[PDB]
Amino acid sequence: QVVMTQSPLSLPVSLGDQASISCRSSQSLLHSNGNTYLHWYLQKGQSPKLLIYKVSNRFSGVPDRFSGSGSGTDFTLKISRVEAEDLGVYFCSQSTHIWTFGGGTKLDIKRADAAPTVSIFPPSSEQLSVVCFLNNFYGVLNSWTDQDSKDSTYSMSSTLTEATHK
Amino acid sequence: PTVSVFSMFRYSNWLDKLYMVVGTLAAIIHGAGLPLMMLVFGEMTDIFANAGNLEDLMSNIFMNLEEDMTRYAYYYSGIGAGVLVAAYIQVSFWCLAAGRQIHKIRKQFFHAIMRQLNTRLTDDVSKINEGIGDKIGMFFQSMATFFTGFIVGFTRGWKLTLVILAISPVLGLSAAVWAKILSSFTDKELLAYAKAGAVAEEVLAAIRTVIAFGGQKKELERYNKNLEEAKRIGIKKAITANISIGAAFLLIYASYALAFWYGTTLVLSGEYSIGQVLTVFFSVLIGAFSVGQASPSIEAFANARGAAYEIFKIIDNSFWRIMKLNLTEWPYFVVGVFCAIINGGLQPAFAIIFSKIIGVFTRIDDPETKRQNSNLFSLLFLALGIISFITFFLQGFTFGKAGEILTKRLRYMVFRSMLRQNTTGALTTRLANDAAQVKGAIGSRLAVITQNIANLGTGIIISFIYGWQLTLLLLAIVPIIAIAGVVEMKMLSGQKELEGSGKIATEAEQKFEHMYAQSLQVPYRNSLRKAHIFGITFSFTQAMMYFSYAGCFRFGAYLVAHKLMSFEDVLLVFSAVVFGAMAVGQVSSFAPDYAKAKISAAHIIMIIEK
Amino acid sequence: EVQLQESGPELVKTGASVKISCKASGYSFSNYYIHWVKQSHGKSLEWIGFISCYNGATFYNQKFKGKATFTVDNSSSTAYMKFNSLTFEDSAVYYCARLPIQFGNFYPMDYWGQGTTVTVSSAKTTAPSVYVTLGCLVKGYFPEPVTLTWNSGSLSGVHTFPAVLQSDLYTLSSSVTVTSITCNVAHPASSTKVDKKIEP
Ligand SMILES: COc1cc2c(cc1OC)CN(CCc1ccc(NC(=O)c3cccc4c(=O)c5cccc(OC)c5[nH]c34)cc1)CC2
Ligand SMILES: COc1cc2c(cc1OC)CN(CCc1ccc(NC(=O)c3cccc4c(=O)c5cccc(OC)c5[nH]c34)cc1)CC2
Ligand SMILES: COc1cc2c(cc1OC)CN(CCc1ccc(NC(=O)c3cccc4c(=O)c5cccc(OC)c5[nH]c34)cc1)CC2
Numbered sequence: 001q002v003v004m005t006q007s008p009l010s011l012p013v014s015l016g017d018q019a020s021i022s023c024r025s026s027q028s029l030l031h032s033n034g035n036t037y038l039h040w041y042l043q044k045g046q047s048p049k050l051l052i053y054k055v056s057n058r059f060s061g062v063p064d065r066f067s068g069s070g071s072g073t074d075f076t077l078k079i080s081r082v083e084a085e086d087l088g089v090y091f092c093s094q095s096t097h098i099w100t101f102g103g104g105t106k107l108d109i110k111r112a113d114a115a116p117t118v119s120i121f122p123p124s125s126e127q128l129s130v131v132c133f134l135n136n137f138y139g140v141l142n143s144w145t146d147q148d149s150k151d152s153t154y155s156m157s158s159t160l161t162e163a164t165h166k
Numbered sequence: 167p168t169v170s171v172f173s174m175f176r177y178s179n180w181l182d183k184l185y186m187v188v189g190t191l192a193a194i195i196h197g198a199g200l201p202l203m204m205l206v207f208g209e210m211t212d213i214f215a216n217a218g219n220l221e222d223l224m225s226n227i228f229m230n231l232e233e234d235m236t237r238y239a240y241y242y243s244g245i246g247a248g249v250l251v252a253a254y255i256q257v258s259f260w261c262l263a264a265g266r267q268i269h270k271i272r273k274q275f276f277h278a279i280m281r282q283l284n285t286r287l288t289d290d291v292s293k294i295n296e297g298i299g300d301k302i303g304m305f306f307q308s309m310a311t312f313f314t315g316f317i318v319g320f321t322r323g324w325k326l327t328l329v330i331l332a333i334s335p336v337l338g339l340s341a342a343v344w345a346k347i348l349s350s351f352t353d354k355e356l357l358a359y360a361k362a363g364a365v366a367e368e369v370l371a372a373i374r375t376v377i378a379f380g381g382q383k384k385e386l387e388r389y390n391k392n393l394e395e396a397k398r399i400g401i402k403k404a405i406t407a408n409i410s411i412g413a414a415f416l417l418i419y420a421s422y423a424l425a426f427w428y429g430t431t432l433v434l435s436g437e438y439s440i441g442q443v444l445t446v447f448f449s450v451l452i453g454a455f456s457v458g459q460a461s462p463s464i465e466a467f468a469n470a471r472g473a474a475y476e477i478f479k480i481i482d483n484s485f486w487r488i489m490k491l492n493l494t495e496w497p498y499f500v501v502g503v504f505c506a507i508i509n510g511g512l513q514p515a516f517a518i519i520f521s522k523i524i525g526v527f528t529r530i531d532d533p534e535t536k537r538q539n540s541n542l543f544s545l546l547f548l549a550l551g552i553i554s555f556i557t558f559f560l561q562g563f564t565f566g567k568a569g570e571i572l573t574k575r576l577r578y579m580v581f582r583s584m585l586r587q588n589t590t591g592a593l594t595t596r597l598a599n600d601a602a603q604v605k606g607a608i609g610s611r612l613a614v615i616t617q618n619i620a621n622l623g624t625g626i627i628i629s630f631i632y633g634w635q636l637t638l639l640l641l642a643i644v645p646i647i648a649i650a651g652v653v654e655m656k657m658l659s660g661q662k663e664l665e666g667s668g669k670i671a672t673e674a675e676q677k678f679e680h681m682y683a684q685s686l687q688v689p690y691r692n693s694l695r696k697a698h699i700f701g702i703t704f705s706f707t708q709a710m711m712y713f714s715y716a717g718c719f720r721f722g723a724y725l726v727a728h729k730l731m732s733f734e735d736v737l738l739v740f741s742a743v744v745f746g747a748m749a750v751g752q753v754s755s756f757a758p759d760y761a762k763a764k765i766s767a768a769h770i771i772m773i774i775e776k
Numbered sequence: 777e778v779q780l781q782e783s784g785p786e787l788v789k790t791g792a793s794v795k796i797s798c799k800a801s802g803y804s805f806s807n808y809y810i811h812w813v814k815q816s817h818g819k820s821l822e823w824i825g826f827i828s829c830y831n832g833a834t835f836y837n838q839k840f841k842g843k844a845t846f847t848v849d850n851s852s853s854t855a856y857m858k859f860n861s862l863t864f865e866d867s868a869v870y871y872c873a874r875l876p877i878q879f880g881n882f883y884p885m886d887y888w889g890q891g892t893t894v895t896v897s898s899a900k901t902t903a904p905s906v907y908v909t910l911g912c913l914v915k916g917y918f919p920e921p922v923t924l925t926w927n928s929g930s931l932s933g934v935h936t937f938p939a940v941l942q943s944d945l946y947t948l949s950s951s952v953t954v955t956s957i958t959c960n961v962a963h964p965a966s967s968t969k970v971d972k973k974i975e976p
Contacts, residue, residue, distance in 0.1 A: 004820075031882075035532055039884040047780070047888040048871070059886070091821065095881040098223075099811070101821040117953075119909040126907055133909060133951050135935055143937040143949070157937040157949045159913070216830050216877065223880040224835060436807050436876050530880035 002027050002094055004102040012110035019079040021105045023092035028072040030096070037095040040068060040077045043104070044088040051090075052077060082107070109152045114138045116156070116163050132158040137165060168471040169478055174298060177270040182263045186302075189259030193303045196252035197310025197456075199245055201318040201449045203712060206245065208322070208445030210238045210719060211524070214726065214733040215440050218528040228727040235723035239716040246712030250705045256303045257657075258701035264299030265693045269686065271477070276682050278481040280675055286480070287671055288664070290473040296660060297470020301463040304658070308460035315453025323438060323446040329428050330447065333421055334454035340414040341458020347407050348659065349462045358399040359598055362392035366581070366597050370590040382585040389581050397574045404566025412558040419516075419551025421451060423544045426523060430540035433527060440527040459658070485607070488767045491572060492608050498568040499612065505561035506613050510620030512554050513749050514628055517741035519546045525734025565613050569605035576601040579774050587776070596773065600766040606758035607767055614757040618750045625742035632735045639721050640743045643714060647744055650707035651751020657704050659755075663689040714744055778802045780872050780889035787919055788862055790898035795858040798872035798889050806830045808874040810855040811885060812846065816868040824870075827855060830877065862896045869893045895919075899944040903966035910974050912959040915947040923962040926952050 003026040013019045021040075029036045040052040050059045052068035055075060065080045079086060087109070092102035116134035123129060134156040136148075145155045178186070213234050221228060272291055279287065319327035369376055369385045376385055429443035492499075523543035526536055577597055584593060622644075629637040667685035670678060722736035781799045788794045798810055812824040825836035827846035834846045845858045855872060870892050873885035897919070904917035914922055920939055935951035950959070960971045 033532060033535070035882070037882065037884075041888075045890070047890040048873075049888075050884050050886050053884040053886075093884065095884070098226075098881045099823040099885075101813075101823075103820045117909070119951075121911060124907040124913070129907075129913070129915070131911065131913060131949060133911060133935075133949075135909070135951060135953065141940050141942060141947075143940050145935060145937055155935045155937070155951070157935075157951070159947070159949065161942075212830075216828065219877050219880065220828065220833060227835075230831075433878065436878070437804055439804075439807060527878065530878065530882060532882045533879050536878070 002029070002097050002100050004092055004094055004100055006092060006102040006105045008105050009103065010106050010108055012108045013079075013082045014110045015084055016081055019082050019107065021077045021079075021090050023070070023075045023077075023102050025073045025075075025094060027097065029075075029094050030072050036070075036072065036075075038068075038070065038075050039093045039095070040066075040090060041093060042086070042088050042090055048091075108147055111138055111152050113166065114153055116165055118163050129159050129161045134158070134163055167475055168468070169474045171471070173478065174471055174474055175267065177267045177274070178263065182266055185259040185263035189256050189263065189303055190306050192252045192255035192259065193306040194310040196249055196256050197307035198314040199249040199252070199712075200311055200452055201314040203242070203245055203715070204315075204445050204448040204452070205318055205322070206238060206241045207448070207715065208441035208443075210235070210441070211444050212439050212441030213238070214723075214736075215528045217726075218733055219530050222530045228729075231727040232723050235720055239720045242712060242716035242719075246709045246716070249712055250709035252705075253708050254701045254705035256307065256701075257300065257704050258697055260300055260303040261697035261701065262694065264295055265690070265697060267298065268295045269690050272686065273679075273683055274481055275477050276671060277679055278483075280679060282483075283480075284672060286476055288668060290477055293473035294470045294477070297466045297468075297473070300657070300660065301466045305460045305463035305467075308456040308463075311456040312453040312460075315449040315456070319446045319450040319453075322449070323432075323442055326425065326429055326432065326438070326443065326446045327450055330421070330425055330450040330454070333424070334450065334457075336417060337421065337451065337454040338458040340417050341455045342461040343410050343458075344414050345459050345462050345658075346465070347410055349465070351407070354403055355400070355602070356598075358396045358403070359602070362389060362396050362577075363594065363598055365389050365392055367590065367594050370584070370593050373590075377585075377587075386578075386582060386585060390578060393574050393577055397570045400570040400573070401567055404563055404570065408559050408562030408566070411562070412555040415558055416551040416555035418451075419547055419554060422520075423547035423551065425451070426547065427540070427544040430523070430527075430537075430544070434533060434536055434540070440524060444524075485764070487771065488604065488607050488764065491576070491604065491767070491771075492568060495568040495571055498564040498571075499609070502561050502564035502568070502609070503612060503616050505557040505564065506616040507620045508553065508557045509561055510617035511624055512550060512557075513621045513746045514625045514742050516550060517625065517738050517745070518628070519543055519550065520741055521734050521738035524737055525732065528733050561613060561617075565609040569609050572605050572608070573602050576604055576770055576774075580770060583774050583776055596769060600769055603758065603763050603766040604770055607760060607763035610756075610758055611760060611763075614753055617753055621753075622743075622746045622750050625746035629739045629742045633725070633731045633739045635725060635730065636718065636721055636736060636739045637743060640714075640718060640739065643710065643717070644743060644747045646707065646710050647714060647747035648751040648754070650710055651748040652755045653704055653707045653751075655752055655755035657700075663692055711748075718744065778874075778887045780874065780887055782870075782872060782889040782892045785893045785895075787895045787897065790863060790896055791861055793858060793860050794862065794894060795856050796870060796892045796894065798855045798857075800829075800853045800855070800874065803874075805853040806850065807877055809877060810846075810848075811873045811875055812844070812857050813871045813873060814868045815871070815891075816865075821871075824857070826875065828877065829855065859894075862894075864896050864898075866896050867894060897944060901965050902945060903968045904948075904961055904963055904970070906959065906961050906970045906972050908956050909951060909953050910957065911949055911951045912961070912972065912974075913947070913949050914961050916942070916945045917947075917963060917966070918945055919965055920946055921964075922946070922948060923960075924948065924950050925960045925962075926950070927958050928960055931957075 005024045007022040007024065011019060011021060023038065029038050031037060036055045038055050039050060041048040041050050051062050051066050052058060055070055056068040058066060065083070067078050067080070069076045069078070075092065077090060087107045089104040089106050091104040094100055114137050116137040119133040119135070121131040121133070136151065136153045136155060138153045140158060140160040143157045147154060213231070217228055217231050268291060271294065275287060275291065316327070319330070365385070365388050369389070376382065425447045426443075429438065429447060432438040433440050433443060523540065526539045526543070580597060580601055626637065626641070667682060667689070670682045670685055718740050719736070722731065722733070725731040726733055726736060779801045781801065783797045786794050786796065806829050808829050809826040810829055811826040814822045814824055823837055824840045824844055825834060825846065827834045827848055829848055829850070832848045836844065843860065845860070847856045847858070848854070849856070857870065859866060872889040874887050875885050876883050899918045902916065902918045904914045904922055907913040907915060912924065914924060922939070924936055926934060931952065931954070933953040935953075937949050937951070939946040939948040958971050958973050960969065962969050
């Protein structure tokens with residue numbers, strides 16, 4: 001089974017700039033017939049859509065922003081001008097040795113860093129568990145929100161039944 | 167000048183009307199049988215293709231192929247048995263109705279010609295017979311083939327059916343011109359010699375005057391000046407007939423090229439399957455060709471209505487010495503034999519190209535490589551068409567020109583030896599027929615044998631290379647498939663026992679007509695028996711073509727499932743062997759009686775050396 | 777258009793069976809395979825197998841043989857995948873994709889279904905327990921979802937975190953932030969509407 005590895009598990013980008021997503025197989029994807037069967041899909045609760053196939057061919061109806069390159073065990077998908085309808089999860093797929101897929105790379109909006117607004121809460125005593133809230137940054141369990149649609153930072157909740165940021 | 171369509175059948179009783187009705191129903195059923203065959207053939211092809219694609223896919227990592235092919239063997243055999251019965255009933259009932267009516271007509275005409283004109287009693291009744299018999303069953307069968315083929319086409323794939331519609335007018339016109347050329351070929355040959363046959367008869371009828379006045383060297387020149395025109399008409403016919411049939415062949419192969427280019431486009435786009443393409447293409451193409459083939463029937467019916475007018479009005483009121491004859495035409499013979507080799511070798515070339523373009527779709531490959539291969543094989547269909555046009559024309563033209571040169575020379579030196587000297591009828595026949603048949607023992611024999619060798623021998627060799635087990639199985643039925651082709655062309659062409667009763671009519675009341683009626687009994691019974699005999703012969707040879715499918719593809723399923731063969735090889739062997747046997751039969755149906763031709767040559771050589 | 781409409785979300789009891797469907801439209805159904813792909817949370821997609829939409833011939837990934845079963849209804853143009861003896865490890869999103877039969881693996885899976893989420897849980901319907909930054913802890917309920925609002929949709933600054941399994945029972949927390957309020961929790965499956973006011 002060929003193992004496909006995507007180097008940036010998360011890729012912070014900026015609207016209008018450029019993005020490049022890498023894929024690397026545990027074994028050469030060049031077929032004995034001279035073709036390399038590596039494809040790139042985009043996933044948004046919608047169906048995955050094929051963008052690039054056979055390394056560099058753009059699918060029908062795909063904008064000219066998406067391009068693909070790569071040779072053997074090393075492939076790349078470049079988005080030239082990251083628009084706002086491109087934020088999603090891009091994953092690679094091989095079909096040379098058979099089907100295996102890459103782990104996916106999520107495109108995220110890049111912004112200036114921020115610090116967590118850590119807030120502690122003692123048990124409400126109506127019972128117990130302790131809750132930490134780390135808001136607006138860029139026997140225990142954790143839960144993360146997705147990137148906010150406006151300010152575009154993250155938030156985190158931790159509950160037990162410190163904050164190591166950059 | 168023509169009688170009514172209803173008044174044409176006024177001598178039919180309840181039994182004849184029943185024969186016509188049931189024969190027409192059987193004709194409709196028989197004609198509907200080939201498009202259903204193509205439907206089943208497409209489904210079978212798709213079974214094989216899907217199995218092959220799945221095996222190609224799971225290579226590195228056919229279970230039900232034989233079980234699936236038993237059902238299709240059953241469908242093939244059921245259609246074949248239905249066609250056997252329906253073809254028998256059609257041919258038999260139409261011949262019986264025609265024979266009973268022609269008998270009643272002959273008796274009534276001779277009764278009326280004496281209750282009161284020999285051509286009208288011999289040849290006109292034969293024209294009526296040719297008009298109201300088999301040809302009507304043919305016509306209904308071909309109409310059914312056309313309609314059913316186009317229904318199957320539009321139900322399986324309307325896009326491809328429309329693309330072949332755009333071509334079907336030209337295909338039906340080609341088939342019509344082809345069949346008309348075939349029908350009128352011998353009549354035109356007899357007509358060309360008419361002006362010289364007149365001079366021959368009028369000199370041989372007054373020979374004493376001629377050799378008394380010493381006009382030998384002048385009657386010879388009259389005959390020669392007319393023989394030149396007969397030869398020129400023969401050359402022109404050899405040009406035009408062969409260029410027309412070559413254009414028809416070219417059009418068939420170009421239809422293959424176009425329909426398969428478009429169909430492979432539809433298969434590579436995922437919209438069609440290759441079996442669907444095969445079904446649609448073969449259905450629509452065979453239907454469009456059948457339409458054309460059904461036009462001699464209309465011409466014959468019109469001629470029957472024309473002939474019935476006069477009648478109903480009257481009623482109402484050494485092989486080495488033979489070859490050395492044609493020796494100065496060795497250039498024509500070299501070119502013709504080369505072209506006959508290339509012409510016969512087009513059936514195995516087609517088998518290869520066809521099997522390859524279909525085997526492109528029975529295993530997986532890159533879509534770009536599949537598009538390239540499909541384009542290449544469509545182009546190869548077109549190249550086959552061009553080559554067939556050229557070589558068919560050249561073979562026909564060179565052999566026809568050599569035959570014309572030989573016929574003119576033989577007529578000339580035969581006349582010269584008769585003048586440098588056995589009734590006049592016998593001599594006119596020796597000049598009109600015996601001289602015109604010596605070519606049948608040279609150029610026609612050479613062409614037929616060379617073409618049949620280059621076709622079936624090459625087919626059988628490459629079939630033994632690709633799949634010897636299937637080739638061995640199909641060799642057992644090769645003779646029957648060839649005979650099926652022969653019988654089918656003889657049946658389409660409509661191809662003496664009345665001469666005895668022609669004497670009682672030529673002599674001439676009630677006693678004479680009673681003698682005539684009694685004289686007709688033996689040929690009447692002979693025709694009523696030949697109706698059944700030919701019906702069963704035709705139906706059996708037709709059904710064997712349907713049974714070949716069942717046998718070949720059941721054994722091919724076995725071989726493909728046990729890995730001894732591929733579906734592409736099974737297709738190649740089927741095409742090559744089976745349809746080369748059919749082509750061998752079709753070509754051999756044009757060969758003239760070699761025995762009669764050698765006899766004619768012997769008589770000609772006797773007269774020339776006398 | 778080519779469309780592969782998948783069935784809807786399914787919540788199943790552990791050890792039971794579920795059949796999910798993929799209804800194809802806009803193309804010749806029988807010229808393609810339907811592949812099934814599984815995606816667990818935070819993992820790579822995983823190929824389960826395919827079935828031929830022509831004759832129903834299947835092929836299963838070795839890990840899934842006996843665990844899943846593909847069928848095809850050629851009349852309705854639908855493909856089905858059925859599980860047996862579902863366990864918690866089968867909670868995932870399942871996609872269908874089509875592959876041309878003519879090209880095999882020499883072609884991508886060009887069109888996909890939108891995905892069917894399958895949650896295999898053995899728990900029984902349970903009502904939640906509801907316990908400047910303020911927040912609510914909606915702990916120990918089943919099944920999802922649970923609607924949380926502050927002052928009945930009156931307010932900005934909210935931060936509803938996704939629900940997390942804690943021993944077969946979801947938990948959830950919220951976060952309102954306002955400089956110097958009611959908390960309405962609506963669980964339909966329990967038909968509960970608890971409105972707690974936060975007090976210092
Ligand atoms: C009644 O008319 C005709 C009678 C004759 C000839 C031509 C006629 O009409 C044009 C040629 N004479 C000289 C010998 C002679 C030389 C060459 C051939 N080889 C051919 O392939 C051929 C030639 C003419 C027509 C056809 C077809 O129709 C035909 C139809 C279906 C299938 C065919 O092959 C697969 C066909 N093949 C031919 C045959 C024979 C013999 C008598
Ligand atoms: C490579 O694929 C293909 C190749 C081909 C075909 C189809 C293919 O693919 C589906 C169709 N073949 C088709 C051959 C083909 C052509 C024409 C015909 N008509 C007649 O015989 C015929 C019809 C009506 C009246 C008469 C006569 O009064 C008549 C009188 C005297 C002599 C005759 O003749 C010996 C006569 N004959 C006829 C039959 C068969 C060609 C090759
Ligand atoms: C049940 O089958 C058949 C029954 C009958 C005939 C033909 C049948 O089979 C097609 C002839 N009929 C009268 C009309 C008639 C005349 C001639 C033809 N010539 C051809 O089709 C043909 C010519 C040359 C080469 C090939 C091929 O390499 C070939 C390969 C695969 C499949 C094919 O075709 C399904 C092929 N065809 C042909 C057809 C039709 C009556 C009985």
